[PDB]
Amino acid sequence: QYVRIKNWGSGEILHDTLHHKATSDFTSCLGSIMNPKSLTRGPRDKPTPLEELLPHAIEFINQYYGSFKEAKIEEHLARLEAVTKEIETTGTYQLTLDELIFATKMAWRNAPRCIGRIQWSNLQVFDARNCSTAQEMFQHICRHILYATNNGNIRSAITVFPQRSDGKHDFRLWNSQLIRYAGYQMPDGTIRGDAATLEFTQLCIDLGWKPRYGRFDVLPLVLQADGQDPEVFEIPPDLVLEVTMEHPKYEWFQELGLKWYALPAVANMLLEVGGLEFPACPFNGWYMGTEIGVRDFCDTQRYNILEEVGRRMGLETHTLASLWKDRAVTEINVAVLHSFQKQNVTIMDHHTASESFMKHMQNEYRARGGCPADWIWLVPPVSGSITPVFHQEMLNYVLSPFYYYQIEPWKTHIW
Ligand X SMILES: CCCCCCCCO[C@@H]1O[C@H](CO)[C@@H](O)[C@H](O)[C@H]1O
Ligand Y SMILES: C[C@H](O)[C@H](O)[C@@H]1CNc2nc(N)[nH]c(=O)c2N1
| Partner interacting with residue 266 (select from ligand X, ligand AT6, a second copy, none; CB below 5-8 Å by kind) | ligand AT6
* 298 a catalytic residue: no
* 117 a catalytic residue: yes
**8 A C-beta contact, residue 128 and residue 140:** yes
Residue nearest ligand Y, Cβ-based: 377
What's the CA gap between 276 and 58, in Å, rounded?
Answer: 12
Interacting residues with a second copy between 28 and 87 (CB under 8 A) = 28-34, 36-39
| Partner interacting with residue 377 (select from ligand X, ligand Y, a second copy, none; CB below 5-8 Å by kind) | ligand Y
Please return the burial class of 122, using the count of CB atoms within 10 Å of its CB with bins 0-12, 13-18 and 19+: exposed
| Distance (Å) of CA 21 to CA 4, 33, 129 | 16, 20, 50
What's the CA gap between 396 and 394, in Å, rounded?
Answer: 6
What's the CA gap between 281 and 306, in Å, rounded?
Answer: 35
Is 164 annotated in a binding site? The answer is no
Contact string 340-369 vs ligand HEM (x = CB under 6 A) = --------x----x----------------
| Distance (Å) of CA 7 to CA 14, 15, 414 | 8, 12, 30
Our CB check for a second copy shows the closer of 21 and 46 to be 21
Contact string 21-50 vs ligand Y (x = CB under 6 A) = -----------x-x----------------
Local structure of 284: helix, strand or coil: strand
Is 377 annotated in a binding site? The answer is yes
**8 A C-beta contact, residue 345 and residue 264:** no
**Position among 72, 85, 311, 391 found at the interface with ligand Y (CB under 6 A):** 391
Q: What are phi and psi of 76, to 5 degrees?
A: -55, -60
> How far does CA 155 lie from the centroid of its chain?
15
- The beta-strand segments (E) located in 111-262 are 124-127, 157-160, 172-173, 183-185, 191-193, 221-224, 230-233, 242-244, 259-261
Please return the burial class of 160, using the count of CB atoms within 10 Å of its CB with bins 0-12, 13-18 and 19+: buried
Residues 114, 108, 53: CA angle, nearest 5 degrees: 135
Residues 389, 395, 399: CA angle, nearest 5 degrees: 120
Residue 165 touching a second copy (CB under 8 A)? no
Residue 320 touching ligand X (CB under 6 A)? no
Interacting residues with ligand X between 47 and 106 (CB under 6 A) = 58, 62, 65-66, 71-73, 76, 80
Is 67 annotated in a binding site? The answer is no
**Position among 87, 95, 141, 158 found at the interface with ligand HEM (CB under 6 A):** 158
Minimum CB separation from ligand AT6 for residue 264, in Å?
4
Is 32 annotated in a binding site? The answer is yes
| Partner interacting with residue 400 (select from a second copy, ligand Y, ligand X, none; CB below 5-8 Å by kind) | a second copy
* 291 a catalytic residue: yes
| Partner interacting with residue 158 (select from ligand X, ligand AT6, ligand HEM, none; CB below 5-8 Å by kind) | ligand HEM
Q: Give me the residues that bind ligand HEM (CB under 6 A), please.
A: 108, 111, 113-116, 119, 123, 156, 158, 266, 283, 285-286, 288, 291, 348, 353, 403
**Interacting residues with ligand AT6 (CB under 6 A):** 177, 196, 264, 266, 283-285, 287-288, 291
Residues belonging to the active site: 114, 117, 286, 291
